[PDB]
């Protein structure tokens, strides 16, 4: 996790993303050492639309 911290500081973004996409867990909060950006509305998960009903 420290090695990641150093890759981020050094900006080895390509490396982190090549590892992240294979499953490497990354604490994205460490990306922001000073201050924090703001949350905004973005599209949400497009849940599968499958029908389910019973019988009366």
């Amino acid at each position: 996790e420290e090695t990641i911290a150093r890759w981020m500081e050094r900006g080895k973004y390509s490396k982190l993303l090549d590892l992240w996409v294979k499953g490497l867990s990354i604490d994205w909060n460490k990306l922001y050492q000073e201050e924090q950006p703001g949350r905004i509305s973005l599209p949400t998960y497009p849940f599968a639309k499958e029908s389910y009903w019973t019988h009366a």
Binding site: T3, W7, K15, D18, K22
Partner: protein, 61 residues
């Protein structure tokens, strides 16, 4: 000699031992089919070829 004097091939095992008797014990357990042996590791390169390629490039590792 086994570290530096043998080409590392596809099927590998490795054992940590502090005495000869311990090594003989662990290797004999391996020969006898024991699936789990303490401080004896089994695996294959053939399996993890992909992640190997992509991680060893950097001296970081």
């Amino acid at each position: 000699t086994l570290q530096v004097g043998r080409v590392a091939m596809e099927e590998r095992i490795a054992v940590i031992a502090g005495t000869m008797k311990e090594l003989q014990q662990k290797l004999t357990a391996y020969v006898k089919g024991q699936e789990h042996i303490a401080d004896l590791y089994r695996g294959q390169v053939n399996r993890n070829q992909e992640m190997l390629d992509i991680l060893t490039s950097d001296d970081e590792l």
